[PDB]
Amino acid sequence: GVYHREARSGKYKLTYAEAKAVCEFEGGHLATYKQLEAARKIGFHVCAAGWMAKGRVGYPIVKPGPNCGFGKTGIIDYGIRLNRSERWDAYCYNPHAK
């Protein structure tokens, strides 16, 4: 099961190597785009872009709203930003995540 998580305690300020570590520390790892889909089908909408794949960031906005709904509905992924030093969250994943 893929889930969304923030930094050690802060939000919107995670990197690639960081988001990944945070995952393995919370019982899981950086999910993938495909996995994000399967999560979307159940209603997994989080404006907090989660670091996944080689370093792709995105946030599936199903429920529009201030500081969230960008107008459109669906996974908001602009693709790699040529820099995994961005400030986002992390879409962990773990069939147990215990």
List CB contacts of 60: < 8 A, sequence separation 6 or more. Answer: 36, 39, 40, 44, 45, 46, 74, 75, 76
Using only the alpha carbons of the chain, give its radius of gyration: 12
DSSP 77: E
Experiment used for this model = NMR
Rounded Cα–Cα distance for residues 55 and 18 (Å):
11
CA 20, 85, 10, 61 dihedral sign is: negative
Q: How far is CA 71 from CA 60, 65, 67, in A?
A: 12, 8, 11
Tell which residue, 17, 2, 20, has the closest CA to residue 96. 2
C-alpha 43/C-alpha 72 separation (Å) is 16
Query: Phi and psi dihedrals of 50, rounded to 5?
Result: -110, 125
Domains along the chain with CATH numbers: 1-98 (3.10.100.10)
What is the token pair recorded at 76?
A: 């908001």
Please report which helix (H) or strand (E) contains residue 72, including its range.
Answer: none
